[PDB]
mmCIF file of C-alpha atoms in Angstrom:
data_model
loop_
_atom_site.group_PDB
_atom_site.id
_atom_site.type_symbol
_atom_site.label_atom_id
_atom_site.label_comp_id
_atom_site.label_asym_id
_atom_site.label_seq_id
_atom_site.Cartn_x
_atom_site.Cartn_y
_atom_site.Cartn_z
ATOM 1 C CA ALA A 1 143.295 75.159 165.687
ATOM 2 C CA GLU A 2 141.408 78.361 164.990
ATOM 3 C CA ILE A 3 140.843 77.634 161.288
ATOM 4 C CA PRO A 4 139.148 74.230 161.796
ATOM 5 C CA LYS A 5 137.157 75.787 164.687
ATOM 6 C CA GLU A 6 135.818 78.553 162.453
ATOM 7 C CA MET A 7 134.769 75.919 159.915
ATOM 8 C CA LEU A 8 132.815 73.948 162.529
ATOM 9 C CA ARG A 9 131.177 77.162 163.763
ATOM 10 C CA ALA A 10 130.138 78.241 160.256
ATOM 11 C CA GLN A 11 128.677 74.786 159.499
ATOM 12 C CA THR A 12 126.673 74.861 162.692
ATOM 13 C CA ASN A 13 125.381 78.392 162.145
ATOM 14 C CA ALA A 14 124.517 77.314 158.538
ATOM 15 C CA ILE A 15 122.484 74.475 159.716
ATOM 16 C CA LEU A 16 120.733 76.309 162.492
ATOM 17 C CA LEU A 17 119.782 79.118 160.153
ATOM 18 C CA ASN A 18 118.372 76.648 157.649
ATOM 19 C CA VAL A 19 116.153 75.184 160.387
ATOM 20 C CA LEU A 20 114.874 78.698 161.108
ATOM 21 C CA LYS A 21 114.327 79.184 157.370
ATOM 22 C CA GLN A 22 111.787 76.392 157.735
ATOM 23 C CA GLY A 23 109.982 78.266 160.525
ATOM 24 C CA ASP A 24 110.042 79.875 163.960
ATOM 25 C CA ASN A 25 111.254 77.225 166.396
ATOM 26 C CA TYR A 26 112.516 76.721 169.958
ATOM 27 C CA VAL A 27 115.765 75.243 171.154
ATOM 28 C CA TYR A 28 114.517 71.719 171.770
ATOM 29 C CA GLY A 29 112.591 71.593 168.510
ATOM 30 C CA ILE A 30 115.720 72.685 166.682
ATOM 31 C CA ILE A 31 117.945 70.129 168.433
ATOM 32 C CA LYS A 32 115.547 67.403 167.581
ATOM 33 C CA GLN A 33 115.173 68.361 163.921
ATOM 34 C CA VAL A 34 118.975 68.440 163.515
ATOM 35 C CA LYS A 35 119.432 65.032 165.234
ATOM 36 C CA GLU A 36 116.820 63.510 162.907
ATOM 37 C CA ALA A 37 118.250 65.157 159.766
ATOM 38 C CA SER A 38 121.733 63.894 160.676
ATOM 39 C CA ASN A 39 120.564 60.457 161.914
ATOM 40 C CA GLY A 40 121.881 60.991 165.405
ATOM 41 C CA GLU A 41 125.259 62.082 164.198
ATOM 42 C CA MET A 42 124.736 65.681 165.327
ATOM 43 C CA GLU A 43 123.027 66.053 168.752
ATOM 44 C CA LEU A 44 123.555 69.624 169.891
ATOM 45 C CA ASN A 45 123.763 70.766 173.520
ATOM 46 C CA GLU A 46 121.472 73.531 174.687
ATOM 47 C CA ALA A 47 124.375 75.784 175.678
ATOM 48 C CA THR A 48 125.844 75.701 172.159
ATOM 49 C CA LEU A 49 122.481 76.897 170.856
ATOM 50 C CA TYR A 50 122.227 79.676 173.384
ATOM 51 C CA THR A 51 125.675 81.080 172.665
ATOM 52 C CA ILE A 52 124.898 80.839 168.928
ATOM 53 C CA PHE A 53 121.503 82.422 169.324
ATOM 54 C CA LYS A 54 123.082 85.152 171.424
ATOM 55 C CA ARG A 55 125.598 86.084 168.724
ATOM 56 C CA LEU A 56 122.976 85.819 165.963
ATOM 57 C CA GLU A 57 120.487 88.061 167.791
ATOM 58 C CA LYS A 58 123.421 90.444 168.274
ATOM 59 C CA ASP A 59 124.129 90.491 164.522
ATOM 60 C CA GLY A 60 120.472 91.138 163.698
ATOM 61 C CA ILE A 61 120.074 87.781 162.021
ATOM 62 C CA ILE A 62 117.657 86.313 164.636
ATOM 63 C CA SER A 63 114.865 87.497 166.932
ATOM 64 C CA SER A 64 113.308 85.903 170.026
ATOM 65 C CA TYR A 65 109.965 86.053 171.768
ATOM 66 C CA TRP A 66 107.904 84.047 174.238
ATOM 67 C CA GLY A 67 105.396 81.833 172.473
ATOM 68 C CA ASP A 68 104.001 79.476 175.085
ATOM 69 C CA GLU A 69 103.557 81.199 178.394
ATOM 70 C CA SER A 70 101.525 80.316 181.416
ATOM 71 C CA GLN A 71 101.911 80.190 185.207
ATOM 72 C CA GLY A 72 103.540 76.720 184.829
ATOM 73 C CA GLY A 73 106.275 77.637 182.423
ATOM 74 C CA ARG A 74 107.234 79.218 179.157
ATOM 75 C CA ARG A 75 109.219 78.609 176.038
ATOM 76 C CA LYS A 76 111.292 80.992 173.987
ATOM 77 C CA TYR A 77 110.984 80.832 170.207
ATOM 78 C CA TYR A 78 113.578 82.123 167.740
ATOM 79 C CA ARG A 79 112.770 83.559 164.366
ATOM 80 C CA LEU A 80 114.743 84.426 161.260
ATOM 81 C CA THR A 81 114.198 88.084 160.320
ATOM 82 C CA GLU A 82 113.793 89.382 156.771
ATOM 83 C CA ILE A 83 116.983 91.357 157.250
ATOM 84 C CA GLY A 84 118.716 88.200 158.446
ATOM 85 C CA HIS A 85 117.702 86.314 155.304
ATOM 86 C CA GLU A 86 119.084 89.094 153.101
ATOM 87 C CA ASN A 87 122.305 89.292 155.166
ATOM 88 C CA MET A 88 122.685 85.550 154.650
ATOM 89 C CA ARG A 89 121.523 85.357 151.030
ATOM 90 C CA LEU A 90 125.048 85.573 149.575
ATOM 91 C CA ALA A 91 126.471 83.119 152.158
ATOM 92 C CA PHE A 92 123.664 80.597 151.453
ATOM 93 C CA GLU A 93 124.028 80.747 147.624
ATOM 94 C CA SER A 94 127.816 80.206 147.960
ATOM 95 C CA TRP A 95 127.212 77.321 150.387
ATOM 96 C CA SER A 96 124.955 75.721 147.829
ATOM 97 C CA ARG A 97 127.874 75.660 145.364
ATOM 98 C CA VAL A 98 130.641 74.517 147.744
ATOM 99 C CA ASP A 99 129.835 70.867 147.120
ATOM 100 C CA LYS A 100 129.972 71.279 143.334
ATOM 101 C CA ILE A 101 133.308 73.048 143.675
ATOM 102 C CA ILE A 102 134.823 70.236 145.709
ATOM 103 C CA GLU A 103 133.592 67.501 143.347
ATOM 104 C CA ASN A 104 134.765 69.449 140.293
ATOM 105 C CA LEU A 105 138.210 69.977 141.784
ATOM 106 C CA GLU A 106 138.421 66.294 142.570
ATOM 107 C CA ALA A 107 137.440 65.608 138.962
ATOM 108 C CA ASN A 108 139.671 68.251 137.364
ATOM 109 C CA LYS A 109 142.723 67.021 139.284
ATOM 110 C CA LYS A 110 142.205 63.250 138.963
ATOM 111 C CA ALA B 1 126.793 91.274 158.999
ATOM 112 C CA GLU B 2 129.495 89.404 160.924
ATOM 113 C CA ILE B 3 128.033 85.875 160.740
ATOM 114 C CA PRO B 4 127.727 85.824 156.919
ATOM 115 C CA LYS B 5 131.368 87.036 156.820
ATOM 116 C CA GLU B 6 132.670 84.155 158.972
ATOM 117 C CA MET B 7 130.671 81.710 156.826
ATOM 118 C CA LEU B 8 132.220 83.001 153.620
ATOM 119 C CA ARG B 9 135.717 82.941 155.167
ATOM 120 C CA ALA B 10 135.202 79.333 156.241
ATOM 121 C CA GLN B 11 134.013 78.441 152.736
ATOM 122 C CA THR B 12 137.031 80.015 151.100
ATOM 123 C CA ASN B 13 139.452 78.341 153.583
ATOM 124 C CA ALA B 14 137.681 74.978 153.034
ATOM 125 C CA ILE B 15 138.067 75.121 149.244
ATOM 126 C CA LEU B 16 141.675 76.263 149.262
ATOM 127 C CA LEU B 17 142.637 73.551 151.752
ATOM 128 C CA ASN B 18 140.868 70.990 149.641
ATOM 129 C CA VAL B 19 142.862 72.124 146.605
ATOM 130 C CA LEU B 20 146.084 71.515 148.453
ATOM 131 C CA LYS B 21 144.772 68.162 149.681
ATOM 132 C CA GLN B 22 144.550 67.370 145.949
ATOM 133 C CA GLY B 23 148.237 68.168 145.582
ATOM 134 C CA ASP B 24 150.864 70.782 146.262
ATOM 135 C CA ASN B 25 150.077 73.799 144.044
ATOM 136 C CA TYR B 26 151.074 77.403 143.296
ATOM 137 C CA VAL B 27 148.984 80.554 143.639
ATOM 138 C CA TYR B 28 148.342 81.190 139.951
ATOM 139 C CA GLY B 29 147.452 77.538 139.375
ATOM 140 C CA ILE B 30 145.171 77.475 142.393
ATOM 141 C CA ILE B 31 143.304 80.614 141.330
ATOM 142 C CA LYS B 32 142.686 79.183 137.874
ATOM 143 C CA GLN B 33 141.582 75.794 139.175
ATOM 144 C CA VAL B 34 139.068 77.340 141.590
ATOM 145 C CA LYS B 35 137.778 79.669 138.887
ATOM 146 C CA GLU B 36 137.171 76.657 136.582
ATOM 147 C CA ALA B 37 135.648 74.461 139.263
ATOM 148 C CA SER B 38 133.381 77.310 140.457
ATOM 149 C CA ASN B 39 132.167 77.936 136.907
ATOM 150 C CA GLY B 40 133.593 81.395 137.191
ATOM 151 C CA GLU B 41 131.694 82.399 140.369
ATOM 152 C CA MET B 42 134.779 82.391 142.755
ATOM 153 C CA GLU B 43 137.703 84.271 141.190
ATOM 154 C CA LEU B 44 140.161 84.746 144.013
ATOM 155 C CA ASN B 45 142.737 87.566 143.966
ATOM 156 C CA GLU B 46 146.373 86.636 144.604
ATOM 157 C CA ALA B 47 146.586 89.133 147.506
ATOM 158 C CA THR B 48 143.564 87.530 149.179
ATOM 159 C CA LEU B 49 145.102 84.112 148.791
ATOM 160 C CA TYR B 50 148.453 85.252 150.185
ATOM 161 C CA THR B 51 146.826 86.611 153.337
ATOM 162 C CA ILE B 52 145.043 83.343 153.871
ATOM 163 C CA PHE B 53 148.165 81.266 153.234
ATOM 164 C CA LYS B 54 150.200 83.434 155.651
ATOM 165 C CA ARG B 55 147.674 82.738 158.421
ATOM 166 C CA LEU B 56 147.696 79.000 157.541
ATOM 167 C CA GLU B 57 151.505 78.634 157.404
ATOM 168 C CA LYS B 58 151.716 80.372 160.786
ATOM 169 C CA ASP B 59 149.406 77.623 162.120
ATOM 170 C CA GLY B 60 151.314 74.622 160.817
ATOM 171 C CA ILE B 61 148.427 73.657 158.550
ATOM 172 C CA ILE B 62 150.337 74.749 155.457
ATOM 173 C CA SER B 63 154.014 74.842 154.406
ATOM 174 C CA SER B 64 155.695 76.563 151.461
ATOM 175 C CA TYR B 65 158.770 75.873 149.379
ATOM 176 C CA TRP B 66 160.523 76.633 146.054
ATOM 177 C CA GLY B 67 160.625 73.992 143.330
ATOM 178 C CA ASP B 68 163.196 73.874 140.499
ATOM 179 C CA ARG B 69 158.131 79.012 141.495
ATOM 180 C CA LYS B 70 156.664 78.958 144.980
ATOM 181 C CA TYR B 71 154.511 75.960 145.972
ATOM 182 C CA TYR B 72 152.208 75.574 149.000
ATOM 183 C CA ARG B 73 151.641 72.202 150.718
ATOM 184 C CA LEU B 74 149.254 70.736 153.242
ATOM 185 C CA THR B 75 151.384 69.710 156.162
ATOM 186 C CA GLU B 76 151.092 66.193 157.526
ATOM 187 C CA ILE B 77 149.753 67.765 160.747
ATOM 188 C CA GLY B 78 147.544 70.081 158.675
ATOM 189 C CA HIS B 79 145.671 67.177 157.166
ATOM 190 C CA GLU B 80 144.908 65.926 160.659
ATOM 191 C CA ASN B 81 144.147 69.391 162.125
ATOM 192 C CA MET B 82 141.527 69.617 159.398
ATOM 193 C CA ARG B 83 140.200 66.063 159.333
ATOM 194 C CA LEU B 84 137.166 66.498 161.625
ATOM 195 C CA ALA B 85 136.153 69.814 160.048
ATOM 196 C CA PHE B 86 136.355 68.139 156.630
ATOM 197 C CA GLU B 87 134.231 65.141 157.646
ATOM 198 C CA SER B 88 131.637 67.494 159.130
ATOM 199 C CA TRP B 89 131.670 69.661 155.993
ATOM 200 C CA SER B 90 131.071 66.564 153.956
ATOM 201 C CA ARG B 91 127.904 65.782 155.897
ATOM 202 C CA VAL B 92 126.382 69.264 155.838
ATOM 203 C CA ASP B 93 124.757 68.853 152.458
ATOM 204 C CA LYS B 94 122.807 65.696 153.348
ATOM 205 C CA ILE B 95 121.701 67.314 156.605
ATOM 206 C CA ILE B 96 120.340 70.357 154.831
ATOM 207 C CA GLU B 97 118.577 68.223 152.191
ATOM 208 C CA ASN B 98 117.014 66.149 155.005
ATOM 209 C CA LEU B 99 115.871 69.260 156.856
ATOM 210 C CA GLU B 100 114.226 70.409 153.597
ATOM 211 C CA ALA B 101 112.389 67.114 153.341
ATOM 212 C CA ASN B 102 110.898 67.283 156.840
#
């Protein structure tokens, strides 16, 4: 229950943070880029993103600001900080190897 | 630095549970297999592993038993408890590569 949940959370955070590695972005831009990159297989809800963005801004990983702002509406953009990137450096490098590890294990068993 | 920590925990749990999906195994064997498959970059301590396996046996994901040495096993329910998380893990790498393209 909790273990699988943590895995799904980490994968989502991983993805979201890679989007922000590509550039400052807003919730709808992010949701769209993830839907395209997963071919419709991962369409995130706004509320998921806000809870995630809340935690991540609380852990210093992310920042927010208003980027489009007029009398008819505004849009909040989220940005990966330099400190966030360094916090995540080790976690990203390890992620990049997880797939090798799995394939190797599958090889080295069978 | 909490979010990186959860990510790394999830990665460790994912690899260990994939090892046991490959077959029942024992702690020393597991540690050596992961060291080889990680080209030496993930050398798990036995104490670390035992903590993880205690949490996982208390969840019904994992079972343990003695053979003829202690072995750990993915439970029949464990496989299912993990199925969706595994499928999702399997897709993450294509998603990231696609993001990089665009």
